[PDB]
Amino acid sequence: MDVLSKGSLKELLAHLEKTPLEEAISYRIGTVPYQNVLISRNEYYNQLYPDTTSLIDGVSREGQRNVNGLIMSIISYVVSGSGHYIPNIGFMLLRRSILDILTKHDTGLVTNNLNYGIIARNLTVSKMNCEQRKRMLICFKLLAYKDGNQNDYEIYLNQNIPLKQIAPNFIPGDMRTVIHNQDQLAIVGIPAYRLTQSTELSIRDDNAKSYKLGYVDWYNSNSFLRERSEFNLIRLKDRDTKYGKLNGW
Amino acid sequence: FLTNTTYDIVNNDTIDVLKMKLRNQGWPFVERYNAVEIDMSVEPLRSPGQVGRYYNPFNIDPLTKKHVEDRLEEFINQVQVGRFRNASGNAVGTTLAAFLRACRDKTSANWRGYSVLVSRYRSLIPNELFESLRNISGEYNINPQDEHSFF
Amino acid sequence: ANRATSAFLDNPHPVGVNYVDEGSRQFVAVAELLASKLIDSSRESDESNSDVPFVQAYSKFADDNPRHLRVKTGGKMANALTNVIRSYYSINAPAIVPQVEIDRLASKATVSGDMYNSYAIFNSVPIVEVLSPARTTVSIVGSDRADVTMLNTGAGAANITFNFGQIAETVILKGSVPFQLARLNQPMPAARFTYKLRPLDGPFIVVLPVGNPLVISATAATRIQVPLAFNKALVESGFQTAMNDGLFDIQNVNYYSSFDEFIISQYHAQDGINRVSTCVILGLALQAYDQMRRALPVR
Amino acid sequence: ANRATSAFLDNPHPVGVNYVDEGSRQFVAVAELLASKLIDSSRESDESNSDVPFVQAYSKFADDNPRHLRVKTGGKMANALTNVIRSYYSINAPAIVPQVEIDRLASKATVSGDMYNSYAIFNSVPIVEVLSPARTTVSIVGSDRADVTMLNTGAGAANITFNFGQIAETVILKGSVPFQLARLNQPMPAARFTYKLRPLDGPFIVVLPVGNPLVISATAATRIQVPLAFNKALVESGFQTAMNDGLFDIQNVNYYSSFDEFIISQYHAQDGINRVSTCVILGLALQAYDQMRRALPV
Amino acid sequence: ANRATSAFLDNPHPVGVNYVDEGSRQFVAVAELLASKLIDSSRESDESNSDVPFVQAYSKFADDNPRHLRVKTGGKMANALTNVIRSYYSINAPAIVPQVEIDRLASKATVSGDMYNSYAIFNSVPIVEVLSPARTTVSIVGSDRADVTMLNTGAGAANITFNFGQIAETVILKGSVPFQLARLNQPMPAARFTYKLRPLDGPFIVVLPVGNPLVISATAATRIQVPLAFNKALVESGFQTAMNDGLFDIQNVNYYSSFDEFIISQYHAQDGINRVSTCVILGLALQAYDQMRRALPV
Amino acid sequence: ANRATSAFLDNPHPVGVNYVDEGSRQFVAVAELLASKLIDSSRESDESNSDVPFVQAYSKFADDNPRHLRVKTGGKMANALTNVIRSYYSINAPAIVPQVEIDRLASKATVSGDMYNSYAIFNSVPIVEVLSPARTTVSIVGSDRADVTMLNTGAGAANITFNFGQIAETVILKGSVPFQLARLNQPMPAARFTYKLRPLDGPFIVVLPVGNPLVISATAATRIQVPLAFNKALVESGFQTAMNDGLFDIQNVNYYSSFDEFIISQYHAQDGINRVSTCVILGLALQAYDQMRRALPV
């Protein structure tokens, strides 16, 4: 919910710096990812409604124990709000931030063998919307810069024409590029249209609307932080600053 | 005030750390209490009716006819016998305890009048106006003197 | 030797392993409590000739004000309850309800998620196996009352071994004619019409004389821990409703005539102590489902 | 000639002769009333966030304020109620609780000791005897619904006599195939699928043709005077709990599948009317036992 | 030649590697401190004739006020304590407790997180190998006190080699009849009933005269660093409770009669020095489990 | 065939049936609480030079002020506790303590007097039956840990049946050499040192190869409901004191080495559910007896 609310590149990377990896990993068993299932949608149909479960749903799924599953759990958390079930990763890796895993070699995780095409296909890039594809491409660029695979990232964009048009423009080592970026990455937000307490047909759409309706409740909740009215009560370390720089950028 | 520290010293302390410091000194009021939602209905008459909900004033449960916290009487007695600033204060616990009993008695005495008042005000707003007012938000700053004087 | 077993005890399909934590248990209890308010408000609306009590309760249940020309189905709460019910039944059923939705709905009303406050009695008769000699025929029918028909065509009397399992508390055996039954390696008693048995005592031997068939009627009672809000009549009505609507139509699952059969069958399978916990939550969910649909019907 | 009879009707054991006075009947009525409030106070407590409704209900029932780190058995009322259920079942069971203790617990609430104001319907089928000729096999299975399977291997048709007793009010007979049934020394009518009979009319004769077996399903309804608080759902649950808790285990007693079988069997014994009176008081005590034990599981 | 070894020293299964950091070590110690307060709250309740001491103790442990009609299970702390015990026993047991939940519970009380403040003495006797000639038979029975029975069927006296490992501090040998024991190259002394040995001294040679069998009883002492709050009486009770509750029911694991056998077996395995550190935290977790479950039986 | 059984399970004698009511159970609980304060008063009288803690503790216990030249005996409470303990052990022991005295002593302190708050683990292993073929020898020794020595002198491998009863929860078997064990009519696994078994699973078959003897060491854990103040160490010490003080010499009673095997032996008899309730009250009385007699010898 909090990760889906971020609407700018600066906010997204700032959230990932303060968020540990354990938030990406889920400890609920879930179900196997790719299955043709029948779900109940009584608002629309009397018969059961066919659908296919996927990894970018908002509900936890079972994940492979390899490094591929860990990266695929991080991206699903960013684009869908929930991760997958990969237990016994370890204290050392789980305490690191999401940005450290994606960008830093000191974590101890080796990810240079990853194939962006296979990861995108397993995440069902075809079913993703524009904001979801932009968020995943941000994760790919950070991984490419960590492994020195910038050339491979560009070629993968050349093969996929729709991905090249929406590819965010920022150098993963320079903070000046992040501040200038004006891409809108928000998935949930205050809706200008009429939003009703009604169900959706597919699993992805229904789960997304739950976060959208939950965010509205979160926005008016006491947990939400109102910068306009309570800026002085925020701690100085985590207070918003114009000259905000990620470490090493 | 009670633990003899300054704002700068406790600037980086979290809520759980702050709760432990106050509880060890003997101060039990370290918790927020959720209000009880009171269901409200406007009879139709000429127009179609409206259904709404509001928080009961002063955190008083109508079913139990008492404050939500079930250990309030024990908590106030704990403050009365407590010592907070022995070196630099006199009768802080007794003075604070007397205020708490006065506040508790008044709220339990006059909660029905204010609960009826809220329902009366809610019945004046039409449904269309209430839905639009849901989008807006605000925070009200009350002077510490006015809040204590109110209760 | 020939082996006969009860039909409903055969091959219990695995139950779901999701939505069994404290947060999900609170959501089911909240749904049951709110569904009961929904059915009582509809009665009050009938007696008062006013829709205010029903609109008042539907808003709490569905988080939405009822509008004409739109079908009343229960809102997002009905969607979560119906899909969670499917997951409890089978492990092949998908888990599609987010955790944010479960937490939000569980906060609507204050209630405990305790599922072990009270107990209930279930009357399904477990006959794990009946072993008979070559020249005899044994047939078992029924679940609530099991009639075992035995015919001996051999020259002499035969011994039939009865295994009632280890879970049932008491088993009462009534025969069409007086018959002799005793435990293993125990002298046979005089012929009697009725026997009260403890299934833990061991396998039981029945002497079947040559002649007219002997029919033994079996009744059993077992104790299972359930929440205080459990109502057997409401749970059974919901089980048939869920079957008619097709929520239990999943691949590679077994179908039972009653919830009593379903819970006993899962109890007698391996790791049945863990299965029976999930079944109890399903029963409470079916009670909420039964009350929700009876308040909001569809032709 | 062969004789077939229902299993549950055979050899009813004598019932207890204690705790049947007016003061003892008041105690059972008080126990049922206070146990019902215990089960209702639990639901009201859960709806709110206060244990006050349960504390008041338990304090009245158990004469002691509930405390944490204690089993919450139920106090002296729970102990006294358990012992009287044992005494009712058999004349061999000892009578332990003194009359002074019964009277003291009966004063906790003001309720009438009348146990015969209302009535209830019991559906056990009392097939006392089925008399059949030499070349016929007759089998009786079931109590709530009695299925009689008869097969005729003789040359000609056989007449089978059915005796349903004199207590049952109505008996409905349904056959697998249409059959002929008539009273003694009466003409047989045309074949019919169903019959409605009054057992007091007399023994009935069924014509059994040669060929495939004929199965007759019997259902009965007998009315028995009970208190108004009587609930068949609660009584049956308490009966099973009573047998599972092992307070019906006495030497030389007969065991039954349900309370309904127990009460019909006693009605057909020698002193049927007197036996049923004690059993009705046992039914109310079992109803209180079920409600009390579900709220306080030990 | 024949090789005989103690049963409990064979194939120690790998132990968990999770919840061994400083933050999780505080959680186990905090849980032990708060679980103890539940036990003493029972006595203080009796002295004060009130449930206030128990309410304060349970509220700190579970983060909810005690309520009647609700089974007191211990709240989130009990669930976390049960799961970390599962993870400690086996490396394949999943770790399902989030670190943020561990940190939140550990903040409930302030304790010394050091698990090496003190030590304890463990009585399991390690007999790694007993080497015997062809014509002799050796049998080893027992873990707390090992009785080694040797019988010589050959013509001449035989030499039996005892290997007690290197971890144990002292081993005391007692025989049914006086016997001679020496080091590998030391000369044999006069026969005497008892011997005190250092396991690091080396393999020990025992002469076995022909005739009646000789039985040697072994007793060992081992020192392992433990937290100061460690109590062997409470750990052993928790070990039995956890086994009965099925907390250790996972595939490809070994089972031991006592926590004494479990910790000694892991000590003698490869990478033993870093295995006993995990087992010590398991013992303190089991100590908290025993106290909490006795106060709140489910 | 041959049959072997545990010695301590043989012929459990009947237990007493007096002083088992709620009021009597309150007296036992009160005595345990006040006796514990007597022992604790000694340490308090050392921290502060005053003897006020002991005088207060003894005055409550004995209803008289302690005197320097008069022997401290415990007063009327000590006599009541000793006589009540004798009654529990045997049904032939007289019950001579008036109920009015028990009720008076139970009013000295406010305690629950409840017997089923918590549980405890008992380590006696109930080897009910070991069935062996003709040419094999089986010997069972030990109660806390049972070693079964089996030797096969036959031509082929022999099957030995182990029956552990239905009461015990878990049994762990460790052998001197790896052996094979499986349930009745089940395929046999590979040989391994240790087995964890549920006694309710059924009789267990062990393959006994021809050659060197095989010894199986058995340990069992059983859970029995006990008060929250129950302490196994104090009960065991009190049990030994009562036997030495002559409290248990009654005609036709069995004798046991420990309270652990006394309660397990009674549990395996018929109506063992009811016998354990009396034995648990005897344990708390023995716990009070130990603390009182150590503080006030003779």
Side-chain angles (χ1 to χ4, degrees), chain F residues 5 53 144 199:
Chain F
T5 191
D144 47 277

PDB file of all heavy atoms in Angstrom, chain F residues 5 53 144 199:
ATOM      1  N   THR F   5       6.588 -58.692  32.245  1.00  0.00           N
ATOM      2  CA  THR F   5       5.887 -57.467  32.596  1.00  0.00           C
ATOM      3  C   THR F   5       6.718 -56.670  33.592  1.00  0.00           C
ATOM      4  O   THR F   5       7.596 -57.206  34.271  1.00  0.00           O
ATOM      5  CB  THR F   5       4.496 -57.758  33.178  1.00  0.00           C
ATOM      6  OG1 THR F   5       3.746 -56.541  33.262  1.00  0.00           O
ATOM      7  CG2 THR F   5       4.613 -58.373  34.563  1.00  0.00           C
ATOM      8  N   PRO F  53       9.163 -13.165  61.179  1.00  0.00           N
ATOM      9  CA  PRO F  53       8.610 -14.001  60.099  1.00  0.00           C
ATOM     10  C   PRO F  53       8.316 -15.434  60.512  1.00  0.00           C
ATOM     11  O   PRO F  53       7.310 -16.001  60.070  1.00  0.00           O
ATOM     12  CB  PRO F  53       9.699 -13.932  59.023  1.00  0.00           C
ATOM     13  CG  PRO F  53      10.351 -12.634  59.254  1.00  0.00           C
ATOM     14  CD  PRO F  53      10.396 -12.487  60.740  1.00  0.00           C
ATOM     15  N   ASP F 144      12.292 -46.091  35.893  1.00  0.00           N
ATOM     16  CA  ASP F 144      12.478 -44.812  35.216  1.00  0.00           C
ATOM     17  C   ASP F 144      13.061 -45.012  33.824  1.00  0.00           C
ATOM     18  O   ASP F 144      12.598 -44.399  32.855  1.00  0.00           O
ATOM     19  CB  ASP F 144      13.373 -43.897  36.052  1.00  0.00           C
ATOM     20  CG  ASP F 144      14.615 -44.602  36.558  1.00  0.00           C
ATOM     21  OD1 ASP F 144      14.528 -45.293  37.594  1.00  0.00           O
ATOM     22  OD2 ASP F 144      15.680 -44.465  35.919  1.00  0.00           O
ATOM     23  N   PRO F 199       2.319 -45.070  22.042  1.00  0.00           N
ATOM     24  CA  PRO F 199       1.820 -46.361  22.539  1.00  0.00           C
ATOM     25  C   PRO F 199       0.448 -46.731  22.014  1.00  0.00           C
ATOM     26  O   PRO F 199       0.144 -47.923  21.887  1.00  0.00           O
ATOM     27  CB  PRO F 199       1.806 -46.156  24.060  1.00  0.00           C
ATOM     28  CG  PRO F 199       2.858 -45.133  24.292  1.00  0.00           C
ATOM     29  CD  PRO F 199       2.715 -44.180  23.144  1.00  0.00           C
TER      30      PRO F 199
END
